[PDB]
């Protein structure tokens, strides 16, 4: 039955066949995005209609199309020609990555710049970087990538050690033309290598680490059915995968006694942006929407056993479309395992003589992706006690530049002559809430300090206040760590045994949000990133906080356009969008390859249950 | 040799013998505190002088003494009579716990109160609670405990389910007198039981949890020598234990190449307070300094294998003094183990063809203690990449009251008629810094936003600023999560290869600090808790942010008195005191026994190293 099952190779081939049959997938066409659509609200009562949405690019320069296909019925539901100057360019194609370097290698301006620096063109790698929207009027309606150069001394060398600063180029990847080459002047190209497998740099490897072995002799405590339905320690969910978003969780519910209680209908990372804070013209245009522009799912790594995922691992191998509509498996792209998580509850009571200890566990669902120099791990955790958590793990190699003589307010030094521009990694979690069903609301909860006086003569009292967010116009919220600000999603028609609305409380890390000036291009294109929390009324076409087409797309779509509708959110089907990020001032310890740093958020039950939900956990 | 070794049973017996011989430990004397003193600055060049400090109480009502003993030389160094009205009462004695209930059981006012509620005196437990300092002039100079009552239906019942609100009593535990019994009126005593081992409440226990087995077939990668010296993955430290503070880490250093580089000289939790925010006269005096008043070390649990600590565990069994000066072992009171900690670093490089993944690990040093209804786990972690972290795990049973008819702004409902007053758990970490040696300083680092304009035409730039804290008068700092505020401890005379001062950056969680009105008794007695970060000049007698004697002690000592000295801290031997806590509005899920909640902080290297320190970690 399962309407939330992963796409199969056969479904993708059939989408390809349907498109071909319909005249939409001739030899000049390329698939820039393909994904299964979630079933509509209700209609789980009806027979399956598996629908797939496709963005089709044309390499001969004709307008791209957005297409919805019913794979069940073998039909095209809708196909519309896109005006990209207005609505955005399609996501970057994997086949365009190589094009920037290739076009530049025969360009006389680029060659003159390399020759001024005594760099062999055969050794110069060019990063294929998203262009954004700035002052270049000729780029409007064209697919442009910008290129920054890095020297590779030999095939196995880490090019990131040798940035070529002072030089940037812009390229039209469809007409195969170089539009501009800007050379503001030579900077020394940093000379030390960054080869973290070279024994001259590592020194002799440690022989001190004795093995750790994590096994489950009876296997894992979770089950997988219908390909992607998980049942684990009262939790129930479906693990989805989308080429843009990566791992998506559907139908997160908890079995409380006999009743399956919904909590979250859909949880995803719906956008992630990496804005750079170096004002040099060489990099001041740099903002990488890894999700919206590049598609993080498509670059998911195949995860090796004992290296990437440790313990008794169950893998999913999601299927995506290549550029021609053929299915491609990402072997072992999603890890699922349970792990010990320390003490769950402990008490040694003097009066009763009873000593009690129980252990915690969490279910882990993860993938790891690679976008250029960056590598990100996306982890979802379900805990025994009802807690839901997300964590991103950032690693890879830092994006480099020259380190200016005389220093910089916007770049860190990593090695002689080698710099790392300041930047942020900012995520948007889209949480289509379903706390005991879809009739939900959100309150902002602050701690309330109280003045010494009548009613409070000793000046010890403190309290809290909750403010219901009633309509979308008042549901754009900032953090306030000093007052312990959180947000509670509740169901006003579902009460616990103490007659209080059931709820879950979101605990944020209260890290800085987008730092750019509010008048900047990035502040408009990544508007979501300027505030910690947004609440909208659910609509099927409001999927990403940046809109459907982010590449070279101005403001006009996404969250600011959604909330303008000012819809009722007080006891309605609502979606929480939480912004959270890392602000990175690179340190010498990040070089030549960076140790993982993390960021995330969690939600804990708040009167959802009638008492602790883990009283039935056994000892030892 | 080891001058930081744990106290042995023999040393404690010898302290007892020295005190006896000197006329200081006759039959009326009781030891309220005993601990080894750290060796003085320098003088590691000289022969050992193991000194022990003792607080001696007199049950016949004579003044207590503070005593310093050289166990090496068999001498009393100093002995001074204490005026407790001025300097504070000695910590609560374990033998006083039972006294409050015992005295009250034959008091006619208490009996009249129990009879008004139809409660059998034989079933009424009385919590022995610290008294603090309020308006009762007769308590000044006397050792007072206050008592709140909880009914125990039968020997194995959890009394916390049945609070007797409306009733409090005060008791002089030396003269064995009841000074006051206050009955403001009857409240219903909540009737449901809170017995989390009763199958009627748990239901049938889960049979779904398959085993997890964590083993190390070649044993752990750390070594223990001289009883308590740890060497693990370039780290070196000594694990101390003190009856007040619990586990204390000494001499945290990292072996970078051939050179042993100090980082932290002493790390401890030097205080922890639990202030309550219910303005009722029954509880408005309630603030439990678990460290300062009760001594968390002395109530350390014996930790069972496979239950409390999982994996290949090495235990320490610290020795403390009983009330008469006899040694008592806390069997298996400290756990030490290493554990896997996910991915350390990962990169899959397109240009080089090299795919690289390494795993992280941490060394864990922990203990768990029980103070009445609360149980706390204290965990220190050392990571491969140089990160140092502390985490507290709070669990146990919530402290209860009646839930008022018509509700409360300062109490949560847990069950019919059962309330849980709001409260905080606030810790002070004392970090006697030694970043590459003792010449250290502290800077406050904020993110700096930048205006779009000349130099920043695209409005993308952002930066940071560092402010040196030069003297103690300017080193009392608050959090600012919005600006990403951290604090960097550096050594201005020790530079990395890039000519920047080596340092470590403290990352706080930016949770709310003490909420009480600044004019309250708790705001003065727990002044440390009102600000996130303090920096002092090291002095051997500045051990606790609350002073040596916290019990029934007003303001006058501790951190506000230390910083008044306004000493130079810019490139000197300094101590960082970080306040961090949990603000707890109890939820129904906390009842009848609470799932662990956590709080903590970490410090990460910040130009301490010349490049990543984990390039020599091997694969797989
Ligand atoms: Cu970064
Ligand atoms: Cu609490
Ligand atoms: Na919803
Ligand atoms: Na110091």
Curated annotation (Swiss-Prot), chains A, B:
Outcome of mutating residue 374 to F: Loss of activity
One example of the protein's molecular function in GO is:
quinone binding
SUPFAM superfamilies (UniProt xref)? Amine oxidase catalytic domain, Amine oxidase N-terminal region
Question: Cofactor(s) for this protein?
Answer: Cu cation; L-topaquinone
Q: Which Gene3D superfamilies match?
A: 3.10.450.40, Copper amine oxidase, catalytic domain
- Which keywords does UniProt give here? Copper, Disulfide bond, Metal-binding, Oxidoreductase, TPQ
Residues at the catalytic site: 290 (proton acceptor), 374 (schiff-base intermediate with substrate)
**Where does the signal sequence lie?**
none
Q: Where does this protein hold substrate?
A: 288-299, 371-376
Give the reactions, separated by semicolons, that this protein catalyses: a primary methyl amine + O2 + H2O = an aldehyde + H2O2 + NH4(+); 2-phenylethylamine + O2 + H2O = 2-phenylacetaldehyde + H2O2 + NH4(+)
State which Enzyme Commission number(s) the record gives. Answer: 1.4.3.21
Function of this protein?
A: Catalyzes the oxidative deamination of phenylethylamine to phenylacetaldehyde with the concomitant production of hydrogen peroxide and ammonia.
Q: What is this protein called?
A: Phenylethylamine oxidase
Question: Which species is this record about?
Answer: Arthrobacter globiformis
